[PDB]
Structures are given as C-alpha cells and as structure tokens.
Amino acid sequence: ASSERELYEAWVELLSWMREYAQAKGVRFEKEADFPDFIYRMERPYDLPTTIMTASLSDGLGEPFLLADVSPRHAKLKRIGLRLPRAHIHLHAHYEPGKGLVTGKIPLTKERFFALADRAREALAFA
Amino acid sequence: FFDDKQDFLEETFAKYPPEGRRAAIMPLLRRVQQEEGWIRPERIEEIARLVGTTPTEVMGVASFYSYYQFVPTGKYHLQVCATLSCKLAGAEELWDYLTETLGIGPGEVTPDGLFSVQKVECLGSCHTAPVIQVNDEPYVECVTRARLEALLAGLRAGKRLEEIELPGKCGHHVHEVE
Amino acid sequence: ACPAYAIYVEPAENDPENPVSAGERYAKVYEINMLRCIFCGLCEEACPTGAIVLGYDFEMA
Amino acid sequence: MRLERVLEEARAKGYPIEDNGLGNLWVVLPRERFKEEMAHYKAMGFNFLADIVGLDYLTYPDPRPERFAVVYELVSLPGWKDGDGSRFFVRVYVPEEDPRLPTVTDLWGSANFLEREVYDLFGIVFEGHPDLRKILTPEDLEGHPLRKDYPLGETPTLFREGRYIIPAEFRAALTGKDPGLTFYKGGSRKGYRSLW
Amino acid sequence: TGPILSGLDPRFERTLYAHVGKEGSWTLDYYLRHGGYETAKRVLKEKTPDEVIEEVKRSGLRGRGGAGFPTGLKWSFMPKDDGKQHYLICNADESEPGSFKDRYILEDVPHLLIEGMILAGYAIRATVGYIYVRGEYRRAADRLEQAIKEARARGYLGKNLFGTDFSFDLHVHRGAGAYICGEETALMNSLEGLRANPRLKPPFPAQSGLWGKPTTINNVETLASVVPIMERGADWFAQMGTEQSKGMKLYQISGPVKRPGVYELPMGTTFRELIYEWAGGPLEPIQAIIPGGSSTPPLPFTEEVLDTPMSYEHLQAKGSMLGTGGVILIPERVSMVDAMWNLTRFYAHESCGKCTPCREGVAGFMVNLFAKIGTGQGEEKDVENLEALLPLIEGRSFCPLADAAVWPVKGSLRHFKDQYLALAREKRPVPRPSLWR
Amino acid sequence: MVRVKVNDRIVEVPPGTSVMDAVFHAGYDVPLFCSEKHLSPIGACRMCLVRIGLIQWQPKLAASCVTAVADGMVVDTLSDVVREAQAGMVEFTLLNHPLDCPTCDKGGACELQDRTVEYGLYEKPLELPVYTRFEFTRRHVDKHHPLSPFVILDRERCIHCKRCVRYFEEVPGDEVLDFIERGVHTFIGTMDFGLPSGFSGNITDICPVGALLDLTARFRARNWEMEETPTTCALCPV
C-alpha cells in the first residue's frame, strides 16, 4: 500500500504529543533507537521526516512507562505500536484510508492519547 | 493490604507446608486483585515481604498469567471469548459492537468507570458460544445481538448481570440451536 | 581493517540532546597517520556506513 | 608418466605418500635414505629443481614428527626432449636437536643459492655445501630469524596527543592455536571448505 | 455392544452423569442417598493396596487428558513410601479449546471426584491431594469448597478414615488462567507458586514432583472413572471398546451443529453416531472436523473420515490423534485459513517464551505469516516459506506445546493445500461473512 | 568406563557426565547458549542438538546438555539432519535482535555473533545468495537503561538465555532478577533499584550476548583492541 507516506506523517504527529506531555507532566522524553536504514544508509534517497524509530516517556529514573515504535521503512505489515510495560498492553495503531490513524476502528487523537498516558503514568510510574 | 485480615493469611498459610511458602502467591495475589479491582506496586511489596522472597520474584510470578490487571479497570471487567469455537460463531462481530458502543480501547476505562474491555482466550463454554465472563462471577452464556444490548443497557442502569433479563436459554451441558 | 595501524579512533558517548552522529556513539578523536599510510580502500570498504571515503588529493607534503 | 615408478616404489619401500586432493603430492623420505633416492630422481628424468622451502612446525596444532622439515619440488620440464610435466614434492623430516641434511648441489645447480638461503633463515646446517654464509640477513643479527620463536618486532605507531598504538594488540585476527576471545572456537572457524 | 466389543451398547446405562442437569446434586446427603462413599467404605478396610492397582490395571483405562501411560501403569512407578508423603494432583485445568467435559464433574457431581481421590490416594500411599481447578471457573470452585466443608465436617475426609492410618485431605487451589499450566510439570510449578514453565522430563512426576516429593497427576475424568471401576468391576468394564481402550468417554462437540454438548457414549462409537444420531445432524455442510482437543490435525469432511471409529487406536492410525473428544466442526462459511489463523494466533498467546523454537518461531514468525497471507499482501513465495519452516519446529522443543502448534498447520498443507495457494496466488484476503446469531 | 563415540573418534569419559562434555572432549564441536560452567543445564536455548544412537538412531534429537551419557552410545555432530537443525536455531535466534553490532559494546566477542559465523546460514553450493527470511517488523522495546551505577541493560538485545537469572538464584542466593511478561513480549527487569548484591557484577561476563554490560567501562575502546593482562587481585586476602 501507499500507506507508507500516510503512516509517517502520523508518526511525526505522535511524537509531537509526546514532547508536550514530557515538559507538561514533569517526565522526560528519551530517544531509544534510530532507524538502521538511516545510519547504514550510504547513498540512498530519503523519505522519512524524522530519524527516530522508537522513543519513550520515562519516570525519570530510567525505567520507561510508555513505548512507541513505528515499523521501519522496508518491512511488510507495517504498523505503529504502543505498549505499556509490566501490564501487557500491546496496541496496534494502523492507518486506514478513509478515516485516519485508528486503533483498529477507534480514531486515535490527542485526547485519547493523553488519557492513555495518564492511566499508564499513574499505575506504573513512581514519579 | 492484609494487615487486618490475618485470619485469611492464616488460612492460606495452613494449606501448604512451612517450606512451600512461595505457593501462597497465587491465592494472595488474587485476593488483592478482587478487592481493589487492581494491584498496585506497594501491594506486591507486601505480598513479597510476607511470603519470604524478594519483590522481584513476586513481580515475575504475578505478571505471568492473564487474569490480573496492573492498571485501573471498570466495574465490569469484560473478558470476551475470542478463540476458535467462539470465533466460528461470530465472536468477531460482538467484539466490534461492544467496543464501538463503549468507545474505548483496551487498557482504557469507559468514562463512567464501569466498563473495561479486554480480550481473553478460550473459556470452555464452547457449546454456548460466544460467551464472556464478567469478573469472577459466572459466564454470561451466549451473546445474541439482543442479549448483548440488553446486558449493556441494563448494566448501565445498575442491575446485576443475572437480574438483567436475557432472551432464550443457554443449556446446562447440552443445548439446542435457538 | 587497516594494515599499518594508521587510524586512531577514540570513541565517545553521544550527548543525547545535541547530536553530531546519527547513532549514539561518536568519534571524539579521529587521527590518521599519513606517513604510515599505504593507500588501500580496505578502510573505506570496511566502514559500514560509508563514512570514510578516500579523496582526491595528492598535493601534500 | 615418470611419476608412477616413484609412487609404486614409495609404496614398496615403506615411504609414506601424503596427498592433498589439490593436485600436489608429497613423498616422505627419511634423512639417511635421502641422497641415494635423490640420485635416482635425477636419473629418472626429473631435470629441474624448482623450490626449497624450510618449514617450522613449532606451533602447528596437530602433532608433527620433528620440528623442522624442508621440502623440495622436483619437476620434469615439459616441452623439452624428455619433458613430461611429472612434478611432485619431496618432504624430509629433520630433528630440532641435530640440524643436518644432505646437499643437492651435485644433482642440480639451482641448489647452490637456495640451500644457502634456508640456512640463513631457518637453522639448518647443510652437509657438504661448497659454501655456507649468511646472505639476506646481515652478520649482525644473531639467530636465523624466520623461526617461530623470535619476535616479529614492532614499533609504536605514533600520533599527535601522545597516543600510540602498539601494533601487536590491535591485531584482531587470531591464530588457530589460540583460544579465541570467547570461551571456545568450534564449527567453521576450525576451517571451512565451501562445497564444490 | 457384543462381547468385549465397540459400538453403542444396547444394554448401556449412563453412570457418571446420572443426576447431572438436575439439582440437589451437590448436597452431600443427596449423593449419600445414591450410594455416596459406599465404594470407599468397602475398599479401605477390606481390599489391599495391590488390588486397587490391579483392578484398574485390568480395566485398562489409558490416560485421560489426551493420551497417557495406562492409568494402571502410571501408578506402578511410585516408590511406595520411603519417608516421602505422596501427593495426588488432579489436573482440573481444562484449557484446550473445545474441551469442557471436566467442568460438569465439579459443578454437578463433586462428591464423586472426592471419593475417587480417596480411592486413588489409598492406592499410591498419599495423605494430601491438591485439586487445581481452572482460573476462570468460580462457580466450580465455590461448589467444590462447599462439598469439602460438608465432607470435612462429618468425617468423610479427615483423620482415621474408616479404621486405616490414612488421613487424606484435599485443597482447592485457584489457578489464574494460563494454558501452559495444563501440562503436568507446569502444574507443579503453579502449585509451588513459581512461574509456569515446564521442567526436564528425564525424571517423571512419579519420582519427583511437588516440592520434590512423588506426585501422580490424573485428569478429572480418569479420577472420577475410578469409582465405577472399583464398584462394578473390570469385568463390567471390559464389554466395551477394542482391547486396552475401554470405558465410556465423554465425547463433546462444539461449533455449528444442531445440538452442541456432552454425550456420555460407550467407546468405539463412530463419528457418524456422534454427529448424526446423537448430535442431531449438522447445520451447514461441514468442511473439516478437529477431532478432540485442538492439538490434533484436522481431518476432512468425508465418508471414510465419518465412518472412522473414534478411539485412541484407530484415530492414532488415521494420521491425527484424539485430544479430549472435544470435536470442533468447521463450516464452509469460513475458509480453513481463518480457522488455523485464529488457532495459531491462540498458540502465540499461550507461548511461554522459554523455548527458542516456539518463542521466536511460532509466536514470532508464524503469526506474522498467517496475518500476511490472510490480509492478502501475499506472495506465492510465502507458502513455500511457511511449509519449509515446519520441520525445524516439529522435532525440537523443550515442551510438547510446540508440536501441537505445528500439527494443524502441518496437516492443512498435506490435504487442504489448495485453499492457501488460492488466497495467495490471486492476492485477496479471506471472505468473512456474518456469523453472529 | 563408558564407551562413547563421537563421529569417527572413540572416547572414554567417566559416567554421569553429560553428552555435551563428551562432544567437546572428542574435539568435535557444537554450539551452546544456555549452559555455562558451574551453572546448571536446563535446555532452553535449544541449540545443542546432536543425534543419538545407542545402535539405532532415534527419531528425536537430544539436546546435549540435558541428556546424560549411556554406555556404548554413539553421538553425531556432523550429520546432514543435524547441520540443518543448527542452521535453523541460529536463524530463529537472530530473528529479533536489533541490528546494532557496530555500536554494541560487546564487539568482537559477542557469543551470538561467534555462533552465527560458525554454524549459520540457511539451506542452499550457492549460485544466488541467501540471507534473511524475516521481513516483518522486529521486536522493539527499551534499550540502554542503567539498572545501577555499574550495570547498563539494553533489554532488546537479549536472546533469553537463562544464565543470569539462573546464576542469581543459585549463587549469591539473592534474588533480584527475573523475566516479566510471557510469550514473545518477555523481558528481564527488576523491582529492586541499585541492584543490591555483593556479586551483581558477574552478570557482565556471563550474559552471552551484550545485554548486561559494565557501565563503568562502556565506550572507551572497542572490545578487541584492549591488551589483556592476566594477573591476581590484591585487594583482599583471597
């Protein structure tokens, strides 16, 4: 699918929410990974508008409470995932042409995401 | 806690040898789970402290299963069957309706604080597929479009799940197709 | 990879907030000994990111 | 063709015949029987002595009879009148205690410089050579330096801040005797020959 | 039917489910007025331990929760006490989709079980029993505790039960849902309250188990079935089935079929009798049948399949196995792909993570393959891929879960191959029509 | 004592010592990722599969660590069915394991790394190259998380050996590490902060991959480059 473009612009969005939340709540942001296919890129063209494959909001003592990973450029069955550790939550945001970025069928928007984050924060984080 | 509940502890510590202490983790965890509707870290520090092993051990044991919730849950923790038998009778479509009615993802709680949704694998009530179990109180056997919408609309109105009326029957141990 | 031992690389840990290297580890010291150098392309081939790429010069002394 | 009467003979006389399936054949002759054997080769139509390699088996990982073994390559020069192309190696074990060995100066003229070299580089005193003297190495370096207990000798590579690299500890390639960096080698890394 | 022979007996009578469906069935005293604990009263003071082996050893009752070294034999390996109190663990965990037979034994005839465990207990020289009931059955666990309170009060469990020096008790131990606890070695960890993983199989439950001490594990059905055995006889028993597979068995069924449920049938009954005569005939025409458990290869819907006798020694030979007799019938309003898709998405959930072959291989490789095929971003190449993965997994795992997760997908490529090749080669997802009633 | 035969060489080897050792004793060689000296085997990595005849080859391939020797047994390392299976397990282990080698500090001495080049590569002499067959999205979780002033944990790296948890349970007797979720999500984590043991540090060497590394010496010079000087401790009377 042509989903590729549409996912990536959404991925920037997703990050954006995380940065605000980080300064807002008094919890840090931490880049985890960068795309292999950017480091080891070596003459290739480029499409991805950021370089961050995984990133997280941490309690402040280095344990994460919220993980966020996009699928890398090449691989099939692309998705964006979220996960709360220690509480087995594995969320699969897909993109659907004709809706937006959806968790299955429910639209993911900022309010949604922020609420999810605070329920995460409150259970798992000690900060 | 279990500070003022020392008979319950005494009961479960009596069931097992004095060196089989780690056994106590299964019942004790499940007690905390029911009474507050979830287990928060501090609880796990107590369970640990009691049973004579480090927190980290108990964290590992606790996190193994799939009943427990380590985030807040609604009043009616909906544990929807979604394994083969149930799938084949259309558990899929139930799960669409339920989730889109309540409006929440998993790990989220309905704005009321009455409804969490959650998948689970088989419950062993295949004859009466699809089926859901609401907390530790017996299975809402069958779920016809009516029975679902009835269950919800009733539950929002504060009844129990056995006092909300439900069309049809669902068998004792053999059933007949409606 | 080099057969003169001509490349001295002191690595260092990337500051998380101001990068100079895409990954997370970088080159705080990179010195290369030209007098010992033999001219290869084994360097260039080995650096898996294609970072070091032999030039166009000869006018040194 | 010429080769065959050597093979059947070696088998007859109890001289082993080592063989790689690489188009090389070695024939192991002891020291005593060498001279006369080597005489027979010259008669037998092996004109041309190509190589003399001194081999040091000090740290080889499978056992070996004696420490030093030299190996000659004798050839029958094809295109010449009795040219044939019958080319084969001869290996001759030599102890570490006594380094004696028969010269072949009187059976080829190639021998003259080559056998001198092997004296210089490995410690092998060649019996009856018209001349031995050190050649490649100056007379001011003791030992026959191409042996395997002898330091290659290294000198720091030098860089601006006062940083040096000692050559020998960058070197990451590991000898097959060595244990390797992890607990043990196995598999491919004790040798791998890609299937044909 | 005829002497020491399979097929529906014309003289049959229900035994185990002689009250089930009716109520007053968990009054101790109701049970008592139907010969409750009679069979125990006789046996403990009269018969020797050896006989309670031998009797069952002749009855020939092989395993009960899906295969098993003959009930009779599994019991011979005990040491018969060298300072170690034995433990009898009833595996009343009943995951395995489509299985739900044991459920009703606890809910409706608990006191049957309790007696069986008193019998069994005495045979293997035990003095403590754990019943590990599934983590999703509350009703069953209440109803079981209730029976144990009754029985414990009046001295049908307790000290000095009928003049012997056995004193044997049971405890309920509520699980918490995790299929892997179903395997007998995982279970020992579960009770001991350590994370569910298996353990090494060169020892067997018999020589070490729960806190080191010799355990014997049996499936609930088997344990209940010890009571008729000791009452009526191996001679009464023997009339049914082929030789060494005997007793009746609670075949159960689910999925589309006009009667779903439990049919207490004599052994050796065919699919035909079960599916038509008993289960009222089909709904939609059946595409394939998953014969017992869910850890079995599917068998196509065919006459030669339908007429196959259901037994552990004819279905052995028909290239599948037989789990708990819990058939699932698969209709043609879904494709086989969606059936195995859903099944192996179950196993990926119930992978435990310890084994490499099943961590990365099934729950990491396989799920994603199915998903790719069955969304139709497919390639022909994938069916070559998927097929070729299978022999690396089958052989080698540290626990028999994996081999149960490959076999259905193994089987579906031996017989039904075409359907997979169809959806891939034309690149189209599954057709999912309505199925919600 | 007992006659064990590995391939083409026969060995004596005292009875009660598992197959694995008899293999290595014979000079033939097989992988390993879950066992280690002084720890305890519990076959788990499922690497060390050989084939066994006692003679009559079995339809089941024993994991060398968890099966004892038996007299007159033949054990085969180099056999076509074996080699195939080894290729397999290597391939599975690498399936999820973040591509990060050059920047990993486990360098030229990453036990996974060394096994791969020894045994690896899946079926096909080649005329067209074969590399990976995964093409879905990898596992992604947390990495480079300090657990303590002396141990950094890059969780995602792990291959789920049991060596460290196993070590902790047996050896210092303090329990401070164990796996968390189940199925594929599994990851080692702690609920004690500072990692409190007087023997925390051993996990750095023991962990086969590069999951548990010694923070005090992270990023200072690549693994191979260091000059390795054997000597003796002098800070305490042992």
Ligand SMILES: NC(=O)C1=CN([C@@H]2O[C@H](COP(=O)(O)OP(=O)(O)OC[C@H]3O[C@@H](n4cnc5c(N)ncnc54)[C@H](O)[C@@H]3O)[C@@H](O)[C@H]2O)C=CC1
């Ligand atoms: N009904 C169900 O819920 C399920 C059915 N299954 C069936 O279960 C089987 C796997 O169960 P397992 O217990 O691993 O089978 P198994 O081969 O170990 O035999 C079953 C029972 O026999 C015992 N046993 C076997 N050999 C013994 C020996 N030498 N000494 C003492 N006891 C011995 C085992 O401990 C176990 O209790 C599968 O092959 C399948 O047929 C598979 C998965 C689930």
Ligand SMILES: Cc1cc2nc3c(=O)[nH]c(=O)nc-3n(C[C@H](O)[C@H](O)[C@H](O)COP(=O)(O)O)c2cc1C
């Ligand atoms: C992964 C796995 C899961 C199992 N789950 C169950 C189960 O849920 N119920 C069951 O009765 N047997 C189950 N079994 C079969 C066990 O062998 C069974 O619990 C035990 O053998 C019962 O004793 P029996 O074999 O004497 O009947 C399972 C086996 C495996 C390998």
Ligand code: SF4
């Ligand atoms: S070209 Fe590079 S690799 Fe080669 S000697 Fe020079 S510095 Fe070394």
Ligand code: SF4
């Ligand atoms: S086969 Fe799977 S569920 Fe079974 S022990 Fe192994 S990883 Fe766990």
Ligand code: SF4
């Ligand atoms: S972090 Fe290391 S030692 Fe621990 S399980 Fe992982 S690979 Fe093993």
Ligand code: SF4
């Ligand atoms: S632990 Fe090993 S395989 Fe993983 S990134 Fe490091 S060097 Fe690589």
Ligand code: FES
């Ligand atoms: S598959 Fe749903 S109750 Fe069994």
Ligand code: FES
């Ligand atoms: S070393 Fe044998 S299974 Fe791991």
